[PDB]
Amino acid sequence: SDFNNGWKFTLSDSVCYSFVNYNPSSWKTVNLPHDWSVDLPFESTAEGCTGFLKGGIGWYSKTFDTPDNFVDKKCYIVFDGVYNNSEYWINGRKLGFHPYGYSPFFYDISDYLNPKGQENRISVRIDHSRYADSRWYTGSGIYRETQLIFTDKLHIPVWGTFVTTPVVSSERATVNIEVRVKNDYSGPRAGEVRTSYFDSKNKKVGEKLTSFLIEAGKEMKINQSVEISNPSLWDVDSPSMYLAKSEILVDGNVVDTKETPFGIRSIKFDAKKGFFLNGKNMKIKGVCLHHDASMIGAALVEDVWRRRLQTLKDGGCNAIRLSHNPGADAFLELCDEMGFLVQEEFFDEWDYPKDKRLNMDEQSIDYITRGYCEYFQEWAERDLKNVMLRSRNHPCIFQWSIGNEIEWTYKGCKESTGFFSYFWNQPPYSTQRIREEWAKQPKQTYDIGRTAKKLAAWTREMDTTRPVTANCILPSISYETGYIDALDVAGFSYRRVMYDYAHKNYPDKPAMGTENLGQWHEWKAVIERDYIPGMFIWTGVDYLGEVGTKGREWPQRAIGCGLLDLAGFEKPSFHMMKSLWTDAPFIAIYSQTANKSSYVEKDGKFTDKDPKKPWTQRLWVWEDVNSHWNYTKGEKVVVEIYSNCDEIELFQNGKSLGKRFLKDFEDHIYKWSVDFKDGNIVAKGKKNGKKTTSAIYTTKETNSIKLSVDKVAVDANNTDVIHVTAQLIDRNGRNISWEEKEITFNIGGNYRLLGVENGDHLNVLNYKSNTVKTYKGRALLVLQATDKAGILNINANSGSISSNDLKVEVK
């Protein structure tokens, strides 16, 4: 835990940094996890696919003494992730090179260590000079937590257990564990593996003891099976966790221990009926999450994600797709605790590169976009298996995904359909015709089907208890290459129109939405079909990058497709999804000028403005709708409600505007023509009896800054964070969202600025400033505690505008 503290770092290269006699004292001290690229300003001379932030070549360093009892023992240094092309040294000796940015790995450093009490030094060189080597923002550095593990020479390896539960019922659960035991002694050894099982409230619920005899140098696999009675099942509403404590015994003495958290749960994908979790037919209400926040970047700070996931959770989301790479262990541990089903991805591309600046097949070749494709042939198996070795015990995981939108990169695929000679239509070619066009294409060095088979084979060597999936952008062809035949569940990417086609032509293959637009028409298609068990919205939260393209130039730093923004504040699209996914009565009120709106009332009924852009084809980014009620007097306005209520009556200033029914609105958006005047809009709604009310009030000028805080007390553990929300209010404390202000925060006491954020995807801002422009009347400040305990006094200004005062105790 504390091994992650007190590292050194410099953004500069020199060969002599690896030598035994080099001292890095004049480098900057840092705590891991660290992403250096968010200490650099957004530069216009950088690339937009990686969010206009540079990389470069940075080094790390870490000093640690050999323990006073390092005799007949092993020492392993474990990294969860380093982005990327990293080289490792210890005490002047080269440990290795690790190309991929997202796989975990480790090094046996036991023989390299200096005698008891003396100083060892580790060095890491990180080459992110290819700073456009991704379609999204990556970060740069040791961006996830590390471990230094000391064990006995008779020990369980790192990731040395695998807990499975093949039979799960409410009376009993069969809980198996495989324990690997490595004998690094010079001669044979005898012992016992004792695995004890502990429930949520620390009561012992099972034990198994098995003898063994392992020869010198070798590894042995010990299978054990127990029966847990009346188990607490892991579910998204009730995420119960057990603890498996495996102990190596010589005589009756504990030589080594590993603790494996696990959860008891059955999962099943039926092709006719949908998906089943503990025998409940539930829809998957998923969202795609990139690994970056905004101000912290790729750095895995658990409290920053906890808040983001808590907001997604309360919006009715029960699943997360880690797009498009392996996630952090700390993030998986969070999904276990909070209750999310997790699809873990391995790769974004296989044998051939995607275009980093554009998308699809790569067009140009230059240095800064050279990605993992250089290493895939030699490294894919190691990376895939390490990911699975690290993550296969987490109960949250329920799908291994081998690829995202891979069809673009192999010649013949797109042209074997009839589309490109596709979003809203089915292939013009028949099943046999597509198959026949595929025979006629020129043979390349690599085949999508053959590589799909190898990856799926490797995946199943490590785990058969979870389905192999993939995100297929062209199902039609992938149904006939052997790519889909490799998978247990075929994920579709933006192919709602292909749901009936899968069910018509390939009915025994479970199929699902794995990347989808955040709209009702996508969800409509899922709930109308029992055989389509859910969808994953692109995206759950806004992410840096995928900009610098035609209509998304500097200074835009994110697309803005996310349900949440770069802060984690709720957007209109989040509320629309909340209305589709939650059960409690819900009403969110928005509006635009009748001119700026997408909708038109002609003779009562509402329709879409452009018939060539109807509600059935709405894409990723939601319209910039207003939540305020501060228009200019008399302006013609279109009010729109997102809601699960069957009846809503609307009231302007107390005068009724009339009841409207959800049955009428084909696009699932309530709509009212209104003539503006000051006062208030109030919506009252009923859902199968149960009532609810919401309202938007006209305000006066900006009078004050309202500061909210999420926690009024945290620990002095160098990791806990404070989230300070700033909001503009009028004289009577009504919230302002129609004018912006440059706000300056002031903080007394010992703290670390993580940064400031407003959630504007269209503009850049300095994260490490104490000043930030508000967006729709609000901003966010993120602080992190440090070593020092004390009190924090937080206030803010905008020149003449003042704020309430907040106090937070750091215990």
Numbering used by the authors: 32 to 452, 459 to 848
What are the paper's exact sentences on this?
determined the three-dimensional structures of these four agarases. initiated by GH86 or GH16B, which generates NAOS. depolymerized by GH86, and systematically saccharified by the exo-acting GH117B and GH2C enzymes. exo-acting β-d-galactosidases, while GH117A and GH117B are α-1,3-L-neoagarooligosaccharide hydrolases.
replaced with W657 and C598 in GH2C, respectively. to specifically accommodate the β-linked AHG residue. generate AOS products, which are substrates for GH2C. AOS by GH117B and GH2C, respectively.
